[PDB]
Amino acid sequence: HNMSVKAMRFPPKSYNKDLESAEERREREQQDLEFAKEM
Amino acid sequence: SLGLGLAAMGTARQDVYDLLKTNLYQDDAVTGEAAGLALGLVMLGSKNAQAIEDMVGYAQETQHEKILRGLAVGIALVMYGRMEEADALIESLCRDKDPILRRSGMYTVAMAYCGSGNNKAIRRLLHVAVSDVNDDVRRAAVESLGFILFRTPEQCPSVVSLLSESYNPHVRYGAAMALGICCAGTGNKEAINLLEPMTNDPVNYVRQGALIASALIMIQQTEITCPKVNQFRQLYSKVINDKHDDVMAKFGAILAQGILDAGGHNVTISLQSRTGHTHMPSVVGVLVFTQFWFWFPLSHFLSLAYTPTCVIGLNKDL
Amino acid sequence: AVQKVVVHPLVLLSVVDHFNRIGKVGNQKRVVGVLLGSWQKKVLDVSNSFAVPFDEDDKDDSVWFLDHDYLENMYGMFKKVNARERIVGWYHTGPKLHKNDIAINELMKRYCPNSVLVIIDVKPKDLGLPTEAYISVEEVHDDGTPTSKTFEHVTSEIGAEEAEEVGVEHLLRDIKDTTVGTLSQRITNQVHGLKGLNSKLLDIRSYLEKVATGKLPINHQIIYQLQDVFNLLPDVSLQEFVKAFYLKTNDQMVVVYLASLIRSVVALHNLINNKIANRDAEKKEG
Amino acid sequence: LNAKVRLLREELQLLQEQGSYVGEVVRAMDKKKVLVKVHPEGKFVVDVDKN
Amino acid sequence: LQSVGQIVGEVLKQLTEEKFIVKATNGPRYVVGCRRQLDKSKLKPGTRV
Amino acid sequence: EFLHAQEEVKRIQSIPLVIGQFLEAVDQNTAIVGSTTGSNYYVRILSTIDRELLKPNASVALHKHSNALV
Amino acid sequence: AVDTAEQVYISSLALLKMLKHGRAGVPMEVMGLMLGEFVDDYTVRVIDVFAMPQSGTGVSVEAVDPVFQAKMLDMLKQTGRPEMVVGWYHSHPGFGCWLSGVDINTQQSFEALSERAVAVVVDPIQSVKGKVVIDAFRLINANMMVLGHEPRQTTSNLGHLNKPSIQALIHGLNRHYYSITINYRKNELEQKMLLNLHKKSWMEGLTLQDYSEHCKHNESVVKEMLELAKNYNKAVEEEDKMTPEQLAIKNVGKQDPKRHLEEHVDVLMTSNIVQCLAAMLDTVVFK
Amino acid sequence: MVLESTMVCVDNSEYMRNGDFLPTRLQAQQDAVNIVCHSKTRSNPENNVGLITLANDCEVLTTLTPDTGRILSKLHTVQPKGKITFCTGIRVAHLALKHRQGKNHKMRIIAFVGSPVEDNEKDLVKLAKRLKKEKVNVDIINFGEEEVNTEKLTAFVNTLNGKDGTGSHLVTVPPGPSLADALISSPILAG
Amino acid sequence: MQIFVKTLTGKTITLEVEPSDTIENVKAKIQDKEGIPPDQQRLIFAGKQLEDGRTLSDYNIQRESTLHLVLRLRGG
Amino acid sequence: MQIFVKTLTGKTITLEVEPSDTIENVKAKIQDKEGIPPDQQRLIFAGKQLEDGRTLSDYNIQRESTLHLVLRLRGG
Amino acid sequence: ENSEKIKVNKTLPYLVSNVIELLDVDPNDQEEDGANIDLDSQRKGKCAVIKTSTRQTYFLPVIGLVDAEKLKP
């Protein structure tokens, strides 16, 4: 089992894709929150 | 106490040591920290054992945090450059349970080993950032790296660029500041390309930090010397006008506007001097500047890093 | 009479505060106070407390001063804000019980005849719990008195309520064992058990030496129970025991065997999936 | 591991925001406008997102 | 003048010790808890609360 | 730290929360539900719940404000 | 003038007391009073707290009679703790944190008697296993905005490290009152003695778990391992015959053998290891 | 104006069953307590009194209080048995006079002796000098089957307050069976 | 003549008064010194809560004695 | 034996005490010779604050030891 | 003064509704002071149940400005 697990993580690579939700959606959410709080 | 401590720094004049001692013992929360700082200034690099044993005593037992939050700098500043000779102090401070003294230990190990990447210094300083429970010391830990790396700018991106992805924002701010301070004189083509996403991080104050570091790294570049100057110019220009962006972010933008055009462009930082030697007043100035987080009117200390950029000729002494 | 007692942590924090709070006032070695709680079946549950002024002089064993009406009306005050609690005992923080203590109990027994004594050690050096619980009984014996009056032992444990447990769990940020599981099942247990047993045997020897000489007020009951304890130890060497022990372990091993086999084949399938999920995707970048 | 931890931490704030209705489309109109119907209410004339 | 009214509904069942599922008089259903002082032995399904 | 952040997400499961019926799942971590108020919603689901207990017509609980499966 | 750096320190004891009291009055808004000292103009410590008796209106409560507190504030000084009062608190169950339109009025007179006063609010049902929802507030006079000024002249970053919730901001907040940051005063001794929670008797560590039920449990678990192993290879054969995009959906309705299998291996191994070790330790340590 | 706190100590040994005085001795001492407590009350209303008693072992019947009714009813309950234990009584009174609400009050002991006691000179002088350091004031009533010739008590007042200090006074037994409370009526004020 | 009062903050206050002064006059003087609404403030002495119409004279008060002042308290 | 009490005013007062004396009694002497009531002070001793239920010997204080003293104003 | 206070509660818009009930309930066995509600217990009079025009039902632990002696389902 240890022998098999040792070599499993070598193929996983080139996983630089790391995004959470968005970049410009935060401004829209903040604007909507401010508009809701105004009224 | 500020004025006198600055104007008499490093002299170890006895009268000022006396007067600052008697001013500290008042145990007052707005006098004692300023006295502590001024004392650190005048006692600079003395490693004066009896003075250290004196000043640690009050810090061991006081009700008022402000004094601790001041003297945490002084007890590092007295200890400059002695490398391993200071170890006995370090082995005490990192042993303390009071968070403020553990925070001070970081500044002390930083100031003891400036310019030399001593393996045990980097090892311990990096280790404590991963494992302490208090966020302020976790900041100050990685903050300290810049002082101990600055002679080899090409190294820092190999380590700081990993920690820049830390989940908690304190470590991110710390790493961004350490990078910005370490390479600050050179418009390094690699480091700058880390900071764009930092300039858009959802946490406001880490954006403030990133703007400061960016405006510091570029101080005299031009669009031909690096391909980014106009980008950051117009970033500052927009965010300073934007009526919706956060206070404690655009504050950083205003400071960036100032620093990038400081001193008629005729000045730059000199933490490394052209003789090959390190230049203490810029080191002190920038260290004290990094503490603006706690007390705004310390920002003026940044001026101690400015040096003229000129060549001048003389034919006779007159 | 009563079979066990469960103590909430709030009284622990309250006592720890009280001890230092009195340390301000005077050179007092000890402090005393009232325990409030409730009953279910044979089980006692104790939850709140307040301190009562107390004084003692080591001049002699018979000169001490506890104030009545402070307790009398303070209990009234507490009653007037929570009706569920009744006076149910008293506590003090001496490292061991003192000679006065039984005559202390005879005072406050008037407030509750079932009253129980709890000791809370304020300075731990050791891995036993800080609490102890004692109840009074008369006991008969052949001669010297019709009955002695004696404290005897009731078992005690710490518990927690729904929300005080959240409160305490917020505070313990600074330490935890890495993982519950077999390493906790051991290190949190067997080593601690062995250490406790060793300390018990050490105390037995420490008494037995001060009975071979010293003051040596010989007490025969101790020797009786010790004879029982030494008689009880089993002979492991017997063949018919050995055959059983082997016939059990030689069975237990088979299950570990089977389980480890299954674990290995599942991990192998996982590796196969990973590799084929890589070789059929890497080619896409040309 | 750091990425998955950060995502888990953000999930709590993400989940707090409001929901959305389900409707049935009748027929489209000019300039990116359609007509929809929500079952316990009257039909609406709505616009279409850019995607 | 400081009093406030209370909704009337019907108990459907008990989930755990302090969580009950109840029905209002108009349609909606809810999961909700109860005061610590009530005799939770009385709250058989079908009672009005 | 991940264990603490894992058990920190159960603030959402507070006491006053409405009851609905599961209809179908459009994809991972998103579904269509029908509240007992009388309307259908297309909403999000919480990660830590078990995905093997969402039967065709089972009964579920929704947040009172966000209407998110809990 | 006021500032943006003031700091509130609370002890553990006040925390446990407030949590217990607030949770007991769960449907309603209970009350209490808190005491401590102003060590300086930048920091305030609260050391201890005591409850108060009320008659409850449906919406809220009023302190029934002041003779009670007039007694208490001298009854306990016979046993040290001479501190003066510094503030009060009430609990909102599940609402959030804010000052109502009458809580403000009550705070008015507290501040008029001493300008440094504070108000505290807690949430005992939303707080779970951490992140206990506590907040602290103080009023501001509308005079200052009539001049066009703003309160809390500012010199430091350390006040702006947190953002208010939308729910707290719909109610008055900055247009009527401002918040103060809090931290927890601790010492090592109480920690050293509190972590004993759920420690257990040494003897518990040396018990042999009734050798007659152990085998029954073992060869009960093995049976479902049988019935699962015979269902594993179907899901192995169907590994690829359908679109993987819907493969997630293939899980949702129906338990999968692979994940559901290995927890049995975990159980079996964890039990059978320790059951075997304990017997050896026993067969050495006694005779 | 002086604020006063007084612990009053009462005898109920076996010899208190004597009735050589015109009434039972209990009545005489009870009225003595009455007059002294009333005098201390009218002296200043914030003054307070506590009740303590001697037997084979001491006891406290009330903590220091400005009330009188509890003192009266409790003393009404009292019944005389056992020996006397003066030294222990004074030491426990010294404890109870601490833990005081009115720290600024000066402290007073009033004591009745109706029986003989085997006290030791050296122990009483040690105690007396200790209390003199404590600066406690003792007043003592010798009566009944008196302390013979006041013999130890004299030295007591000598070693304690009562030399180099007029805080403490010994009143001899009024030998006539007439009501001692009426007869000590001057000595408590002309102390 | 003059009288004292104290309160749970440790504050003390001193009032020039006369024995003929009513309790409501006292409350008025307190508000004049500090502005507190007379209905939120409450007074205690001798274990007795005060009422408006009686006077210093009939309250049996004497020179420089110290009253206790306490505050109304409600949520809402 | 002698000790010195450096007030915040700069005035240093000579106090005669003994190791058996107690901090409450030093406060008493302070009120005696300088009038200041006993709750209006804090005793700093260039370190931790003194506590009144403790003897002078508990602090290892010795002949001619010097201390500084600060006021304890409360309320306002 | 208190009278005008009442006057301002009445204001004008009033929902209309029907009395469904008239009910009579007694306190708990123990009624401590501390946290306790002066409404859900410790009123000697009746309590009521009403139905609003918007088809809601409300319990009323106290009736208000009208004497129960003249209300009928």
Swiss-Prot record, chain D:
Domain of life: Eukaryota
Subcellular location(s) of the protein: Cytoplasm; Nucleus
Family designation: Belongs to the AAA ATPase family.
Function: Component of the 26S proteasome, a multiprotein complex involved in the ATP-dependent degradation of ubiquitinated proteins. This complex plays a key role in the maintenance of protein homeostasis by removing misfolded or damaged proteins, which could impair cellular functions, and by removing proteins whose functions are no longer required. Therefore, the proteasome participates in numerous cellular processes, including cell cycle progression, apoptosis, or DNA damage repair.
Subunit description: Component of the 19S proteasome regulatory particle complex. The 26S proteasome consists of a 20S core particle (CP) and two 19S regulatory subunits (RP). The regulatory particle is made of a lid composed of 9 subunits, a base containing 6 ATPases including PSMC5 and few additional components. Component of a complex with USP49 and RUVBL1. Interacts with PRPF19. Interacts with TRIM5. Interacts with NDC80. Interacts with PAAF1. Interacts, in vitro, with the thyroid hormone receptor (in a thyroid hormone T3-dependent manner) and with retinoid X receptor (RXR). Interacts with ERCC6.
Protein name, as recorded: 26S proteasome regulatory subunit 8
Origin organism lineage: Eukaryota, Metazoa, Chordata, Craniata, Vertebrata
Swiss-Prot record, chain E:
Record localization: Cytoplasm; Nucleus
Record-listed N6-acetyllysine modification sites: 23
Role summary: Component of the 26S proteasome, a multiprotein complex involved in the ATP-dependent degradation of ubiquitinated proteins. This complex plays a key role in the maintenance of protein homeostasis by removing misfolded or damaged proteins, which could impair cellular functions, and by removing proteins whose functions are no longer required. Therefore, the proteasome participates in numerous cellular processes, including cell cycle progression, apoptosis, or DNA damage repair.
Annotated family: Belongs to the AAA ATPase family.
Quaternary organization: Component of the 19S proteasome regulatory particle complex. The 26S proteasome consists of a 20S core particle (CP) and two 19S regulatory subunits (RP). The regulatory particle is made of a lid composed of 9 subunits, a base containing 6 ATPases including PSMC6 and few additional components. Interacts with PAAF1.
Record protein name field: 26S proteasome regulatory subunit 10B
Organism in which the protein naturally occurs: Homo sapiens
Underlying gene: PSMC6
Residues of the full protein shown: 50 to 98 of 389
From Swiss-Prot, chain G:
Sites of Phosphoserine modification: 127, 201
Pfam families linked to this entry: JAB (PF01398), RPN11_C (PF23594)
Residue positions binding Zn(2+): 90, 92, 103
Tissue: Widely expressed. Highest levels in heart and skeletal muscle.
MPN domain mapped to chain residues: 8-143
Residue positions of motif JAMM motif: 90-103
Keywords, sorted A to Z: DNA damage, DNA repair, Hydrolase, Metal-binding, Metalloprotease, Phosphoprotein, Protease, Proteasome, Ubl conjugation pathway, Zinc
SMART domains in alphabetical order: JAB_MPN
Recorded superkingdom: Eukaryota
One GO CC annotation: nucleus
Gene Ontology terms, MF aspect: endopeptidase activator activity; K63-linked deubiquitinase activity; metal ion binding; metal-dependent deubiquitinase activity; metallopeptidase activity; proteasome binding
Record-linked InterPro entries: JAMM/MPN+_dom (IPR000555), JAMM_MPN+_peptidase_M67A (IPR050242), MPN (IPR037518), RPN11_C (IPR056263)
Biological process annotations from GO: double-strand break repair via homologous recombination; double-strand break repair via nonhomologous end joining; proteasome-mediated ubiquitin-dependent protein catabolic process; protein deubiquitination; protein K63-linked deubiquitination; regulation of proteasomal protein catabolic process; response to ethanol; ubiquitin-dependent protein catabolic process
Phosphothreonine carried by residues: 243
Top EC class, one word: hydrolase
SUPFAM superfamilies reported for this sequence: JAB1/MPN domain (SSF102712)
Family assignment from sequence similarity: Belongs to the peptidase M67A family. PSMD14 subfamily.
The protein, known as: 26S proteasome non-ATPase regulatory subunit 14
Source organism of the structure: Homo sapiens
UniProtKB/Swiss-Prot annotation, chains I, J:
Membrane topology: Peripheral membrane protein
Residue ranges of domain Ubiquitin-like in the record: 1-76
Domain of life: Eukaryota
Portion of the parent chain present: 77 to 152 of 229
Protein name per Swiss-Prot or TrEMBL: Ubiquitin
Subcellular location: Cytoplasm; Nucleus; Mitochondrion outer membrane
Post-translational modification: Phosphorylated ubiquitin specifically binds and activates parkin (PRKN), triggering mitophagy. Phosphorylation does not affect E1-mediated E2 charging of ubiquitin but affects discharging of E2 enzymes to form polyubiquitin chains. It also affects deubiquitination by deubiquitinase enzymes such as USP30.
Function, as annotated: Exists either covalently attached to another protein, or free (unanchored). When covalently bound, it is conjugated to target proteins via an isopeptide bond either as a monomer (monoubiquitin), a polymer linked via different Lys residues of the ubiquitin (polyubiquitin chains) or a linear polymer linked via the initiator Met of the ubiquitin (linear polyubiquitin chains).
